[PDB]
Each structure stands twice: as C-alpha cells, then as structure tokens.
Design a protein around this ligand. Structure first.
Ligand SMILES: Nc1ncnc2c1ncn2[C@@H]1O[C@H](COP(=O)(O)OP(=O)(O)O)[C@@H](O)[C@H]1O
Ligand SMILES: Nc1ncnc2c1ncn2[C@@H]1O[C@H](COP(=O)(O)OP(=O)(O)O)[C@@H](O)[C@H]1O
Ligand SMILES: [Mg+2]
Ligand SMILES: [Mg+2]
Lengths: 646, 407
DNA sequence: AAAA
DNA sequence: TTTTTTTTTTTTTTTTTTTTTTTTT
C-alpha cells in the first residue's frame, strides 16, 4: 500500500523522513518500538500501513523477533487508551541524538510549505499562511484552550536556558499574551524571508524567455512589498488571532493536574506511579501546571540536615511504634487522590512541637498543595445557611489541612464533621460564581492543649478518629530526673524553616516514608499495629461521655432503691448534672430517651404497659448521699522500619 | 575561542568593545574585579570564554594568582543563587570613569542598527524596528512587568534634574502611561533620522554608475515618506505596544521591596546590611519602589533637635536600663525581616506620654512602613458571621504597629 | 497628467 | 447580621476606512 502513502499528503512522507533518523538499535529495543507504536496509535487509526512499514524498518531480526509482534500491540485493540506517550515526542527522540539532519529536514519542510504558498498566491502573504507556517515550525511549545467563562488562554512549555521564574522548569506556565511568540515571528521568520528572497533572485539570475523577464520581477516586487508587513503590530495581532485556532487542543484545561501521582517540584516533576519514585528533568507530555519550590533529592541519611531532623523527630515522640504510625500517616499528604477516612487529633500541653511540626509539613508540601484551616469549620455550632463561606474552600486538590491551638476546650458536633472525613463529595457556594461540587482528598490533623468536647456515641463517628497524647514537654530548666523533659531552641522555629535545605531533607524523608508504606501492605493505614495508638483512642472514648459518667456516679452501685417515675425526671437529673458537672447546652429529649435504652440501664429499663418506659428503680442522689447499697527500642536506626513486628 | 567569541554573538562584540577604556587597576584589585566577574557570570552561562578572556587582559592576575581558584569561583557563580548583577551596572562605571568616548560608540552602534534595517528593507519603517532601536538605547528606565490583574505596568527610574515629587529620587516609580517615552521617541529619534538622511545624501553626492541614478533616489524618497510616521499618534501607540514586549522583565513585581536591609529614604535608599549604614545617592540596581519623606542624616548629638529629643526621652522614663531596653526594642521597627516574637504593653497615667512617642515613631517611619491598628482586633468575638475583617491587610510589609488609648 |  | 456581596460596570473602540505618492498609462 505504498501508493496509498504516496497519495495521502506530503505530511506522511514528512513523518517518514523524520522517523528515518531512528537508529536500528532503537528499533531493536522492545520498549522503544512498543511506545512508538503506542504513540502512532494515539494519533488516529489510519496509520496501520505506516506501522506495517515500521515492521520492516530495519528488520534485521523481525523474523527472529516475531513477525506478528509489532502488529500484535495494535491489531489486538485498535481502540482503547492508556494515557501513554503520544506524538509530540518522536521529534524529541530524533533530536536528542540526531542533530543536523533533523534540523535541515524540518527547515526544508516548512521552507517548501512557505514557497508553495508564495508561488501559488503571487507573493501576497496573509495571516493564515504565516500562522500555519509558525504552527508547523513550532507545534511542540504552545497550547491553547478555553476556560470556564470562555477565553483563549495561552500555555507555553518552559525550557532551561531562558528567562523564567524560580521553579517553573519543565512544566507549562500560563501566559496572558504570547510574548515569545511575537518575538519569534518578528525575528526568526526573517531568516525564511531571506532564504525565499535568495531563492527568487537565484532563479531570476538564470536567463530564459519572456516568462521570466517580467513574471519574476513582478512577484519579486510583490514579495519585497509584503516582507515589511511581518513587523507590523496589527498584522501580527491578526496572525496570532488566526493561529489561536491551529494551536487549539480539546480537553486540556480540565485535565490539568488531574493525575494524583505527579508532583511539580522546583527542579522538574516528580512521579510516584512506580517504585521507586522517578524524577523527570527532560521533555515529557504530562499536563501539569501547579508546582512547589522544593527541590527533590533521594533520601540520603548521611546528610547532616537529615540526621538532625531524624534526631529531633525521635526526641519529639519517644514511642517507636507511635512514631512510625505518625510518619506513615503524614506521608499520605503527598498523595492527592482518594484516601481512607482517618481523622487525627492529638493533645498536649505547653511546649509540644505539634504546631511547629504542622508548620514544617505545610511549608515543605507547598502552598498549592497544603492549606491552613480555621477551627470554626469544626466548631459545628454554626449552621451555614444559604450564604457564602470561603473558609470551606481551599480544599480543591489540596492534600493536607492542619489546625492550631484554640482559646479553650470547644465542642465539635458531628455536623460539619461527618462530611469532612468521608471520601465523598461536598458542595458550597462563595462570592460570585455559583454552587459547585468537588471531591475532597486532604488528610486532616488538629492538635490542641485543651481537650475537644465530643458528644456522640455512634460507632460510625468513633471509627474515623485517632487520638494520641504527647508525653514529652519542653522547659527552660531540664532537670536530669525524668526522661520527658529537654532543652529548647528559639532558632529551632525562628530558623531551620527558612533554610531550603531543611525543606529538601524533609521532602526526601516524606518520599522515603511513602515508598516504605507502599512497599508494605498495598498502601492503607488500618494495618501495621501500634498498641499505644487506638488504645489511647479507646481510653479517650471511655471518657468524653457524660451519660456513662452520670450513670456510674448516681444510679450505679445503688440499684436496691426505687425512686423512678419516667424518662422525665431522669432527663431533669441529667440536665442539672451535666449543667453543673459539665458545661450548659440544649438538647432534645428524644435522643436521650432513645440512648437510655442503648445505655447500661437495660437491666432496669422495662417498658410499662402504658408505655412511659418506666425504669424498674434506682436512687437519685442528693446532697452527699453516701453508703448507697450496691515497645522494643531500636538499636541504632529506626527509619529502617525494623522487621515486620517493628 | 576568541575568534569564536567575536564570531557568533553581536552583544559579545558589543561587550568586547565596552571592555576597553576600563580602569585595569580595578581588575588588579581583588574585590571589584571579583564583583565584575560575578556580574558577567550572572549574564548567561555561555560567557565562559568571554570571562576567561576578561581574566586574560592584564595577564598578571591570571599568571600570578588563583587561576584554578578563579575558575572555581566562576563555576560556583554559574551554579549558585546570589546576586545577579549585570553589565548595566558596568555601563554605569564605564560612564563614571570613562566619559565622552562611550557616547560616540553607542551612538554609532544604534545608528548602525537603524542603517542596517533601512538598507535591508528599502527604508520601509515599521513598529518593530523602531521599538528595537529604542530598546537599544534607554534600558536605564521603563521596565515593564505584568501585574496580578493581568495589565502591563510601566516603571520609570527617576534621576536628578527631572520633574518629580518629593523623595522619588534614585528609585523606581509606577507610571500609568510612559509619557517620557512618547516625548523621547518624538524628539530625539529625529536626530538619528537626520543622521541617516545626511548619510544617504553624502553617498548620493559621490559619483557612481547608474545605481545612484535610480536606487538612491528611490531609497531617499521612501525614507522621506517614512520619516513623518514617527509623529503620528497611532504609529507611536503601535510602537509602544510592540516595545513593551522587549522591555518585559520576568520576576520583577513580586521581587520588589523584598530586601529587608534596604529602606526607601527621602534622599535615595539606605544600606543597613553592613555596619555602618550607608546612604546610596547614585545609580544602582536594587528594585526599590516604596519610600518615606524623611531625609536621612548621620546621628549627630551636637544637633540642637537631637539634644532636645534625648533630654525628652530621659525625662519621660528615669530608669536607665529600662530606657535602653525599650529604646533597643523600639529601634527594631526599622528592620523588615523576621524578628523575635514578643509583645510589649505598658500602662500609666493620663500624662504618661506613651501616646506621643508611638505617634512620633509612626510619623517618622511613614505610612508605607508604619500602620495603626484597632484595639478591637484583640478583643472581639470570633467571625462566626462569616463577614470578612477590615484590618488583616495591615502588617503586610509593615515594620511597626501600635495600639491607641481606650476609656 | 490621470488613473490604479 | 447586616453587609457587601452583588451589582454595576467594563472595555467601545481599535482596527480601520479613507487613501498612498508614485507608478502605470
Ligand atoms: N529537637 C529540638 N531541639 C531544640 N529545641 C526543640 C526541639 N523540639 C522542640 N524544641 C523547642 O520547642 C519548640 C517546638 O515547638 P513548640 O512551641 O513546642 O510547639 P507547640 O505549639 O506544640 O508547643 C521550639 O521553639 C524549641 O525551642
Ligand atoms: N518630655 C516632655 N516634657 C514635657 N511635657 C511633655 C513631654 N512629653 C509629653 N509632654 C506633654 O504631656 C502631655 C501628655 O502626653 P500624652 O502622650 O498625651 O500622655 P499620655 O500618653 O498619658 O496620653 C502631652 O500633652 C505633651 O504635650
Ligand atoms: Mg507547637
Ligand atoms: Mg498620650
């Protein structure tokens, strides 16, 4: 079907010529031709003859390597996509090792296009022709798409060796106006103009009859008149407007940063799809726009900053299992996709380092991925009616949200808490715009020196919470008596965060911990046992429950007496109790009446014939009313995770 | 690589021309020579042979000194983050020490650029070529950057002898529309146009073959037709719109006033980076925009006002140690970097004098650096009503804040 | 000198 | 819990066009 290739445009032969530069050993390498055939698969489906020819491109071992091998990867499923390497990269592969011939090939290609136009239209250039030439001579650097309200936005791929901001290398950036496009079309297009002029003059030099006496002279005059138009402002604006359509790429803005396995770092892009994590500092095609200014380096414990951070972290939390669990939980901040519904809250007193730690994670992870959340969200006392609340945002794409110390112990009702931990979707509206729904995937931590007042009993609420209590405090007089006391350092917070090397070391530690967790039981947090954790949590759940305390304080150990009317006097006694014993708050009697059955009073809770669920009998206490009748410590390194028990 | 140095890069030839007429004693001296080497290294990493040749002129340093040390210094300058000085500064020293001869050099340079364009395109001027020629001159002023609102903004560097407000000297100012650029392109570019016309007239005067019969006549007619375009308003607007692309400088607005050791003073800027403080009243490259209307003079206790203020300070609070401590703490407001996190609060009678001092500090530091807050910020209910506050925009870039009295 |  | 967010604007022409003197007749 070579004649089909002959008839099907000169672009097919252009691709033929550019791919001819691929060495035979490149075609021998199995992944190389695998990804090449995938790339040609992504570009339409009529390139089956081209792939068949590629089977015979340097076929020194096609029979040895299997005749039905290259076509197998395409004929098995011509449809279907895998988000793999498409075109826009074969040219890069050719250029990375085969200069000179590649550049002259592309030069003669767009020169032929422009010469065809100038011959066809008698040297009268216009906007569309110049736009097409520009797009042909660089289609690998700019992308245009339409945003929400509807505009044409220009994105350009940044390369080393050009003016730029810090950390925006090897990734797209948003340009309000394509400045470099104007500079290029004004500067480098003059080279093609000079080449065309020299070609025309050379053709005019050779003598012939009247067909060249005036025809070349007329077209030469027209071309030299039209040459100066490329320096115009209105003409250039029109050319840019025309080229806006050629650079159009459907489905690019809404696919930006959608992949949760790609992170934008200061020195490129970080990929955590495969183990170990891979850093890309060359040409690629992943559509990433957001980034952080933290350079990524492999986790090397020999670095002095890494050693200092590891020692400080070990000093902050003594328990090995708890430390490992905390680091594993914090390593999930790197991920931005769906995560298990876990809420972490851990208490303390005075100097605990909790807030300081939160700050390190926030700065290391960057602004585009981490956020600061107000406690008013989890106060749950305020019920947001139909009105904007910007505090509920700042969770789009973020993978980390942390809180701070509050004024005093505060209540946290299950409302505005159940939907903040679940892997579901939530909706809210803010200034301008309208209501929208977004998936939330941010790990949340909230530490305080005052206990959170939790008023609930359902297992559903008490299953996505983990509670820890720090045991090491910091005081300016570290008496060498108890281990839970150490000296402080003002520069431990005033500095050690501004220095970028500390952020690099912490990022390396986070990446290493995420890799270690992934090499473990296929991710997840529920496994890997830590006896201290979830045991402190169940102990906390034993407390923070006024009803059980009321029952064990007033009616338990005094069952012999019988002073019970109905749920009403029990409600009043509990109300005066909790009002005095605890804070004052308003409640609905139905919840208490229903929970009383679920309480430990079932041994005396029996529904009377006329309902009223009269308790069989207890004693309500007034006045004093006494006499009522009834681990291994790691040797030298702990980041090595120890064996499986750890 | 010297032939390669003057083979490929036009501004490489320009820098080679500039490197002459220099005070080589500064090259001999380690500090200033190291500074200019750092500045050249910050101007792209492809100038390694150029820097080597600059170290080769007056070969005494390259023969008697740390040749490997100098190479390592240039390498680390290439691959480290620090000052990014540019030849601009150099151009300033070249003007300061070697006047006159540079003027004709730059004049002939941009005249050559314009003449090359005219000869290449048959005297058919257009926005881009005049924009590029204008950018060949200036560079001193009119730096363009994109704001957060997406609008291009022009910043003009103020020099003595210009119509400006008080305290705007030796620092950038925000310009809604480059009026000086329009005036300059309309006025001074006519001189270069007249030079081109005289050049072509002189070549027309000399006798040659039939080329002068028609070719120079056509070129002169085209140039005469195109000369009047520079006075047209639409042409000037297009030229400015095209020129703002060349003057565009990445990472300028967000890198403005970021240095905490430089303070915009009424006589320029202050360099509190090193002891003692220096006042800069000449050309520089620090991106300073904000300023205060308070002139700076060295601390002279003999001045009557200084004596009066010191006596008043002594009379306000008697304790010597307390006076020194509070004065040291109050002097921290001049800095704008991170500081020790401590809060000072002091009470007293109706004639305590607390308010007066706070007011003097605020007035001296100016509105840009000092701000007054509201006492209700500390004593208020939580913003459960979701209504945004009106005070947290304060302290952004400020170095001082004070609270007033309350009954 | 009048039209492109 | 008004209050300010929402509402009110926001660019509105500019581009051009015309011609363009010289060139062709
Ligand atoms: N490893 C350490 N080395 C030196 N000082 C430390 C260390 N860990 C904690 N500190 C001291 O304690 C503080 C850590 O933050 P901290 O104030 O305890 O946070 P929190 O808000 O949880 O109390 C630092 O200011 C420092 O002085
Ligand atoms: N050093 C001083 N010597 C004499 N009078 C002073 C001095 N400082 C302030 N005063 C006067 O004393 C009054 C008290 O100043 P003010 O700061 O208002 O007191 P307070 O701070 O208690 O309100 C001012 O009216 C001022 O004129
Ligand atoms: Mg803390
Ligand atoms: Mg006062």
């Amino acid at each position: 079907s070579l004649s089909i290739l002959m008839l099907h445009d000169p672009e097919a032969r252009y691709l033929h010529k550019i791919l001819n530069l691929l060495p035979p050993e490149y075609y021998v390498e199995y992944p190389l031709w695998s990804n090449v055939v995938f790339a040609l698969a992504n570009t339409s489906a009529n390139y089956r003859p081209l792939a068949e020819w590629f089977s015979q491109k340097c076929p020194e071992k096609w029979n040895t390597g299997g005749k039905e091998k290259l076509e197998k990867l395409w004929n098995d499923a011509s449809h279907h996509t895998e988000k793999k390497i498409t075109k826009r990269s074969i040219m890069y592969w050719a250029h990375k090792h085969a200069p000179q011939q590649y550049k002259e090939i592309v030069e003669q290609g767009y020169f032929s296009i422009l010469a065809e136009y100038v011959y066809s239209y008698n040297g009268m250039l216009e906007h569309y022709m110049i736009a097409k030439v520009i797009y042909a001579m660089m289609g690998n650097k700019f992308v245009v798409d339409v945003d929400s309200n509807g505009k044409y936005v220009w994105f350009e791929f940044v390369l080393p060796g050009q003016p730029m901001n810090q950390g925006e290398i090897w990734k797209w950036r948003k340009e309000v106006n394509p400045d470099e496009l104007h500079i290029y079309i004004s500067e480098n297009f003059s080279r093609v103009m000079d080449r065309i002029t020299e070609h025309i003059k050379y053709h005019l030099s050779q003598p012939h009859e009247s067909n060249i006496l005036n025809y070349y002279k007329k077209l030469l005059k027209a071309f030299e008149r039209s040459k100066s138009k490329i320096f115009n402002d209105s003409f250039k604006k029109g050319v840019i407007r025309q080229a806006e359509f050629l650079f159009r790429q459907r489905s690019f803005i809404q696919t930006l940063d959608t992949n949760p396995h790609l992170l934008g770092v200061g020195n490129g892009v970080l990929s955590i799809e495969t183990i170990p994590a891979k850093l890309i500092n060359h040409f690629h095609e992943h559509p990433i726009h957001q980034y952080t200014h933290i350079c990524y380096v492999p986790f090397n414990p020999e670095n002095p900053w890494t050693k200092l951070l590891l020692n400080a972290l070990q000093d902050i939390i003594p328990e090995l299992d708890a430390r490992l669990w905390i680091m594993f939980y914090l390593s999930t901040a790197i991920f931005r996709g769906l995560k298990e519904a876990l809420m972490l809250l851990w208490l303390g007193g005075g100097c605990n380092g909790k807030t300081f730690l939160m700050r390190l994670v926030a700065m290391v992870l960057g602004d585009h991925y981490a956020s600061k959340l107000n406690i008013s969200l989890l106060t749950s006392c305020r019920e947001t009616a139909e009105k904007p609340n910007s505090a509920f945002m700042r969770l789009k794409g973020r993978g980390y949200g942390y809180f701070e110390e509050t004024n005093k112990s505060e209540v946290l009702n299950t409302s505005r808490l159940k939907e903040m931990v679940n892997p579901g979707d939530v909706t809210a509206r803010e200034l301008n715009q309208k209501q929208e729904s977004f998936q939330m995937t941010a790990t949340m931590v909230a530490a305080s020196n005052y206990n959170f007042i939790i008023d609930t009993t359902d297992h559903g609420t008490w299953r996505r919470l983990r509670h820890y209590r720090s045991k090491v405090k910091f005081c300016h007089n570290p008496d060498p008596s108890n281990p839970y006391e150490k000296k402080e350092d003002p520069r431990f917070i005033h500095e050690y965060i501004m220095d970028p090397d500390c952020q690099n070391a912490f990022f390396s530690i986070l990446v290493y911990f995420w890799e270690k967790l992934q090499k473990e039981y296929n991710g997840q947090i529920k496994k890997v046992f830590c006896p201290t954790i979830e045991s402190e949590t169940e102990a906390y759940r034993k407390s923070q429950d006024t009803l059980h305390r009321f029952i064990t304080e007033r009616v338990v150990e005094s069952p012999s007496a019988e002073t019970v009317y109905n749920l009403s006097e029990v409600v009043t006694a509990y109300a005066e109790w909790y009002n005095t014993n605890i804070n004052v708050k308003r409640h609905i009697a139905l919840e208490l009446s229903q929970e009383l059955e679920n309480s430990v009073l079932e041994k005396y809770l029996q529904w009377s014939p006329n309902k009223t669920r009269i308790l069989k009998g207890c004693r309500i206490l007034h006045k004093f009313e006494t006499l009522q009748p009834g681990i291994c410590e790691p040797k030298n390194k702990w980041w090595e995770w120890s064996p499986n028990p750890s």
